[PDB]
Design a protein around this ligand. Sequence first.
Ligand code: NAD
Ligand code: NAD
Ligand code: NAD
Ligand code: NAD
Ligand code: ADN
Lengths: 460, 460, 460, 460
Amino acid sequence: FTDYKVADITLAAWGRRELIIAESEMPALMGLRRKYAGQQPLKGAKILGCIHMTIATGVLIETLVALGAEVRWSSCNIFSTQDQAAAAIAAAGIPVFAWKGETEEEYEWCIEQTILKDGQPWDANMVLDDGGDLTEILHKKYPQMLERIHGITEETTTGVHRLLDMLKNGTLKVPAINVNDSVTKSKNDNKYGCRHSLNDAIKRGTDHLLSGKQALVIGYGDVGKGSSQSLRQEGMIVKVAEVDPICAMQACMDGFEVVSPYKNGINDGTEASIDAALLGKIDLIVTTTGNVNVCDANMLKALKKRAVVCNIGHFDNEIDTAFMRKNWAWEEVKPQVHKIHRTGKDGFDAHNDDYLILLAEGRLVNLGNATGHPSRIMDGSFANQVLAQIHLFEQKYADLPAAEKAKRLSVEVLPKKLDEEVALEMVKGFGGVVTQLTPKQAEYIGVSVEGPFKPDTYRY
Amino acid sequence: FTDYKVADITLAAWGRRELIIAESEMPALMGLRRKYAGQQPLKGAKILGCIHMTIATGVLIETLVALGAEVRWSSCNIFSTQDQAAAAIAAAGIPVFAWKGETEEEYEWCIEQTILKDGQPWDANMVLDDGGDLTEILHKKYPQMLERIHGITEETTTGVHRLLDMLKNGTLKVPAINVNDSVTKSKNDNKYGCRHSLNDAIKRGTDHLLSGKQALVIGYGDVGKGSSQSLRQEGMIVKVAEVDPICAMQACMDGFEVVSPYKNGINDGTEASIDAALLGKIDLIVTTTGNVNVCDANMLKALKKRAVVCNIGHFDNEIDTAFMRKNWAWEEVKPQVHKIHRTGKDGFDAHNDDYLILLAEGRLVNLGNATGHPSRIMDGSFANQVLAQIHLFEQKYADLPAAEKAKRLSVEVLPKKLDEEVALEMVKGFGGVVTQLTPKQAEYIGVSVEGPFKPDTYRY
Amino acid sequence: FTDYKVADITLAAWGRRELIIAESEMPALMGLRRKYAGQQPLKGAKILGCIHMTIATGVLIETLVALGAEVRWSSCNIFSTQDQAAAAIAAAGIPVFAWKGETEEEYEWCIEQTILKDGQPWDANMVLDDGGDLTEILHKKYPQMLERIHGITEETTTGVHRLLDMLKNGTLKVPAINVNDSVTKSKNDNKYGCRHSLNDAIKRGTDHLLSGKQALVIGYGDVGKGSSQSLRQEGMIVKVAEVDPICAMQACMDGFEVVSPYKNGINDGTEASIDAALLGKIDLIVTTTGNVNVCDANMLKALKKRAVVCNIGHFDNEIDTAFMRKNWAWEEVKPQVHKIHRTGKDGFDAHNDDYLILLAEGRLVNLGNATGHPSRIMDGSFANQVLAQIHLFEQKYADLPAAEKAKRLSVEVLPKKLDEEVALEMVKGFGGVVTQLTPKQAEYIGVSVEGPFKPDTYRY
Amino acid sequence: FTDYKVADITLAAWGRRELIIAESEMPALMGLRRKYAGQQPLKGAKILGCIHMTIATGVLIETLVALGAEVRWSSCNIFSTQDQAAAAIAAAGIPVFAWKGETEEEYEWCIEQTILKDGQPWDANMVLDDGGDLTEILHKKYPQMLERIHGITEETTTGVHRLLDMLKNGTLKVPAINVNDSVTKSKNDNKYGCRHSLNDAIKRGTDHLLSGKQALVIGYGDVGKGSSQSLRQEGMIVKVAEVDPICAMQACMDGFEVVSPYKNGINDGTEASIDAALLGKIDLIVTTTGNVNVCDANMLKALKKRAVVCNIGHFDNEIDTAFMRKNWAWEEVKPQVHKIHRTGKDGFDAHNDDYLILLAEGRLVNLGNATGHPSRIMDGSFANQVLAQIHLFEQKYADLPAAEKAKRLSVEVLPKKLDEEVALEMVKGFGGVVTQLTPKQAEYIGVSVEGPFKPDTYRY
Ligand SMILES: NC(=O)c1ccc[n+]([C@@H]2O[C@H](COP(=O)([O-])OP(=O)(O)OC[C@H]3O[C@@H](n4cnc5c(N)ncnc54)[C@H](O)[C@@H]3O)[C@@H](O)[C@H]2O)c1
Ligand SMILES: NC(=O)c1ccc[n+]([C@@H]2O[C@H](COP(=O)([O-])OP(=O)(O)OC[C@H]3O[C@@H](n4cnc5c(N)ncnc54)[C@H](O)[C@@H]3O)[C@@H](O)[C@H]2O)c1
Ligand SMILES: NC(=O)c1ccc[n+]([C@@H]2O[C@H](COP(=O)([O-])OP(=O)(O)OC[C@H]3O[C@@H](n4cnc5c(N)ncnc54)[C@H](O)[C@@H]3O)[C@@H](O)[C@H]2O)c1
Ligand SMILES: NC(=O)c1ccc[n+]([C@@H]2O[C@H](COP(=O)([O-])OP(=O)(O)OC[C@H]3O[C@@H](n4cnc5c(N)ncnc54)[C@H](O)[C@@H]3O)[C@@H](O)[C@H]2O)c1
Ligand SMILES: Nc1ncnc2c1ncn2[C@@H]1O[C@H](CO)[C@@H](O)[C@H]1O
């Protein structure tokens, strides 16, 4: 078996030990393996997967395989692979092209190695994506391959937005499931995942005390809510920026001060618009938005000396790292930790006090500087992924006539009943006990004893 | 002016001082007053109002009046009136029939005094309701009056459920707005309101230390989430019961142990089904469900000696108080606090150790034993109420032809843009500063610089 | 029985119900009753008591009586009496002179009614004091009475400081126990008591939302630590002022921003020295210091409009209320809540926006606007008081010859073994289980299996 | 330069980058460098140092050198060295013998390499110790060397206990400072250090979700307080065991359930004494005691399957790791992480469900599986160490006449004034501003404007 590329295949036994532990942490995912092992619902599925090559993702991959699928895998970030996970999957005879610390050129080559087998399109018929890079490459460069693909299952808020843009422009060629918007994904992974893994990544990157220091979190969606709590539970003084006044209201009610980097919140792109007094007090800024340039050049100039700067939104353009590459000297402390010397770009003084610490070169900090979300959280997301792969593979869109395709070309979520069944496996993994409604109680609130327990309008 | 009934009209000056302070705590509601005072959009509105006669409700009433409405008011709970609020509204020449500590017969008489003026149906044309008792009385006993009514605006989860049952059965006679499901209502009031006011009510009722004691919260919807945090922030050891596995998963991830009062979560109606070990360690039980008999006779028998029992869901049947009235002696400590002696019903021993403390006779404990949610939280709910009253009054359903009525008979929410404009007023009241998107950023995430910022699918 | 003065004797039955509940919350105190009831160790003790006439203090009083003592009682604050507690103690035939809302003249008359019986010195032989007012009156005005007094047991940090000043000046006439510095007092009452009761008092006084608002706590000793947590757990953004850099370090490490009301912390008494930017953002200031003028005239001028101002340190000169009485109009909202109109002193405008809300006229806010600490916390303090009364009464200082007195005239704390025995009763009241050391473990750490478990140097 | 032993000297540049960052995190320590660089108060000091060879310890070593000292260094734990710190110190030409993952034999050899230079006792005259192993070796094996030594400065609770046993037995040969009991050490390092670093080490070791899981912390001293908060802030359900009822009372008041591993807290050496129900629900046990066998063989047998076991007290005998080495198969997952298979010792099944995860082989888990306390916390401890070294070096005990030695042979703490001056540097490092007392205020509370602010009795 040679159909892989990883950092170091000799890490495989360590990765396999960590997979066996992670299995014990992922009861929804292991439950789907046990339930569906017999029926082989993914027999004949040939899945192109592009998602962080972590231990949790290894458990996802081997669940899809255990259900009958063949896969070809890559990471969706240059710094998110755990090399022992990649090695364990390769050593199992699964095609994987992933290592921690890829270049952009290697990143694109890895996705290509999944799309091509022996220099020709692989007989792919399904896609699992996180962020939409593989989706975009198939649409732009491999339209013939999408002809035979039954669907896309998309992990993340950013990737869903890209799908919806394609659907609205009439350029989306195969149906998708939005896995992100299962409640056991969005309100589990995006929020509690970041709670666990943000302070984990800052500690591993910097070993800084957080207690007593000043943080600014840009955004208060699911990731900004979890991120703010990661920091506040360590004793940080957390301020929150938002453009959405409903998310801002939540921040205030959750006990955070809501501030703008700009005077009166007006971002007109002059230095004069920067609240230099506010930024000069900030010890840590974290971007969580999915948006562009929310920690901009003028904010970076105004930040407190030796502030930590990081991004936990899907892509690195949240922080103006291009400005920092053009203007300032980068001193590497260790992989995914750089001092950015604001003294200029012509070398640096090792003892200069005027620097920022940038984590993971502005890419997803939880996965770049630590191991991302813990397996027990990723269990929810990845149980959704498997159910989404089963649904779209069984629907066989590629085999439908033109007229039938027209009726099914959509971006849909999983039904609430499945969301509830994932949650129940998650709760039992904590040793939680869910109460059964009596028939009188079920009638009184207008639900089945079996669920679903909430209308699709319910926000949790 | 004699067209009222309150406990003590001499409390009016105290209530008016508290209204003036509450005005300074309610910028969304005061904002609507200032914005709409000139246009008088409720000129000709005649509003039957049935909602807790508190200081916050006073500010809501005087906002509707300031916008041109006439009203006739009652409380929707026997114990929720603040007598100084009721006095200040009566002393202003507004018809209100409300006092703290009504009987059921007085409660029904008060609603009837709103419906009748000088012994004849009032020319009502709008309804503001909280829990649906006034809605049900108009439908069952005054159907002729609903001919003239343009709409119902409903405050609470329980009242919405009752409207949706009427809609589904074809018995709803006028269109309604579900005020509850604005995010600035549900995810503000139902959650953060209970955070503030649950521990407040237990302290005022009992003066008990909560720190270090064991709580069981039944339910983990918006109210159970807020309630659990009310108790956990005081240092209670909180366990959470749920029938909805997605809500249970949230509980676990929020750091609570999820338990059932019943062995394996199966309540088959036997004492054998009760987890006597669990209930024997509980110092406080709080019901939050909107369901029936979630703290049942067998649970009450198994509770630890001197446990506190209370309900913060809309109606008192969450706790089996009928069982306690039939079997056990009630010793009143002070209004809305009773020792329930489990020794039997034939008098009580003042020194008996075997009692439970029931708050507010099992009625909404935050309003019964304290003052309910703080005005700054009720600002969101009541700004939505005013917008909903303006919308349904302006739509003039009662004046539509038969064909037009058919098309408009619905239970609807307010548009997200209005929800965001309420939130922004709330955020400014904290001195929060919301960031303005740049045109490039607004294009990048696919929103208008003015919002709305989120799809209607978004759960916050 | 007529040897009392209380607000309303008809409140006695309500107070007695609350005493019987409080007994169930005070296992250390009830434990001392049961242990010592037989031995009557306070037979012949005649105790002048001056401490907040609350329900917890009623349980203390009836414990001293149950051990054989006679008492004559007053409160140590004009607003701290619970009238139902005072009535229950009077109705039991115990001399008590206390009501909520005394004048200064009534306060002094009440202490005098304890000292005098039938217009002559009572045959007092013990003193229980909280703050040192009764101690000072006996020393200044009744030296002949101290001749026959065996000791003083002093509750609070301020009262101990006054005793130590007397000891150092050679003016202290009888030995004292410092009850404050039992760990089951200082690190229980002073800290956790304020955690429970500060936000309780602000809620009862104002019903304000705290979540999302800005607080400044002056001081970070035991009371400032508890006070800061009371506010932070509600979601306040808490800043902390301190003069003690070790207490300030704790604040920083506990996740608070440490600020001064003065520029660079320099209090030179010009308006120019005030950080107007900081004070203009503060929604609540709480003084916790035991010191004078820590919320001074220039700070009060600079505070944000409609800020709440309160004191939870023993005496009201922490806030410059004398400046506010001289310069600004007071509008009473309700007892122990005043709007202080900064527009001037010549009446007020009911609708003026420029006011502060002062709680309890600057006197102890937890007891003034709520019920002070919960009984389960006061159990520790009051178990210490009883043990201290037993010790000094049994030592019989007044009967010692001059030479023997000289050897015993001291301010001492209780032995650690007693501190541990109080704690153990407190832990069992939570249903806590303390582990017993094995003989090998006891030898390994160098302690008896029975304790004491820590050297007297240990700070906990 | 060859007078060292480290893992890999090529790590020196990485370690030096991390020293330069740590300098910016350690203002008390860098303050002492700048203040004392000119006076060279450790000119002629020859310091045997035995303390964790971390980045923070590097900054301590180079401060002592900058003040004039020569040193010879080793770690006080086999797993606590950061190899890049050891390399950076060796590359600076400082003798250090330390690497992560020493054997016991290498550990003893490393201490001996400090004691011997070129095979002969080094002319040592000062000792800096953490845990007392170097102190004990000099007393037992090199008594002649203690003739020349002016003092010992001891870091930790365990090492202080050992010194006090030596003092009491008349076997202590040189005076010592108890650095541990500075407030800026004990109530900073021992508590907040473990808050930061316990969850850090469990995350790096296991990547386990902590939220929603059950923890048992044995002990609630400074380390158990910090440890319990490390876990509770992550959303663990934390139970606390204690033998000291005052520490247990704190636990209850801090919102933790106090339990014993043994029925009624009595461990009589039988499996029957184990609370199997309690231990069967525990997902993580952490020992914090400084005592022996507090997580014993019977507890380990009764623990839930796949529970994590770790020790954050100084020495590994807190957990019965000898029982586990004698009875159960150890599967190494990665360095300092072992699955302990309870199926027996004759190999293991890679897929066995019945295992515990032991971190750092039961050695100090924060240093073994992460990087120990953050530099900003260690700043307090290490500023005290430097002041203690200056004081004992300047007192020159070894040069005193016999009579003078007699009078100075003691275990003492640093004066409070120095403790306050360390704290103030720490507070300024957060950008905290300490308020200056006015002369009137300083007189009112009876302190100097300069401090000290508290009596030596004060516990903070
Ligand atoms: N690192 C991870 O493990 C992880 C986990 C899940 C999601 N993600 C990524 O995180 C990003 C956010 O995802 P989400 O689910 O929280 O999305 P979301 O839509 O729930 O939240 C994003 C928030 O950012 C706010 N925002 C936008 N522009 C802003 C600006 N200029 N200033 C301040 N606030 C601004 C929006 O109002 C919104 O509330 C996405 O890119 C998503 O793919 C990362
Ligand atoms: N007191 C107040 O101030 C206040 C505020 C808002 C709403 N309410 C009332 O509170 C109630 C709940 O409102 P909400 O918005 O939280 O509703 P919700 O639907 O958000 O939450 C109710 C929860 O109860 C759970 N539940 C139902 N039966 C249960 C059972 N037998 N055991 C355990 N859990 C069970 C459901 O699964 C659900 O998650 C309603 O009656 C509502 O009108 C009161
Ligand atoms: N209300 C209650 O129930 C309650 C409870 C116990 C004690 N008390 C009273 O509270 C007060 C404080 O008691 P404590 O035990 O916390 O005392 P403490 O000595 O532990 O704390 C007082 C703190 O105030 C600080 N301080 C002094 N002047 C200051 C200034 N100008 N600015 C900022 N900080 C300043 C000191 O440095 C000290 O840390 C006393 O008067 C005590 O009798 C009240
Ligand atoms: N890992 C680190 O970074 C770090 C930091 C500081 C100290 N330490 C070490 O941690 C240990 C504890 O230090 P500390 O300052 O907290 O000491 P401490 O004396 O403050 O606390 C130890 C606690 O353990 C309790 N205890 C003893 N035997 C017990 C038993 N059988 N069951 C339950 N509780 C029991 C004691 O009552 C005491 O409260 C020492 O070995 C110390 O040197 C480690
Ligand atoms: N990063 C670290 N560097 C050095 N010593 C540390 C570190 N973290 C914890 N310690 C010390 O470990 C000691 C226990 O041996 C504690 O007293 C503490 O001071």
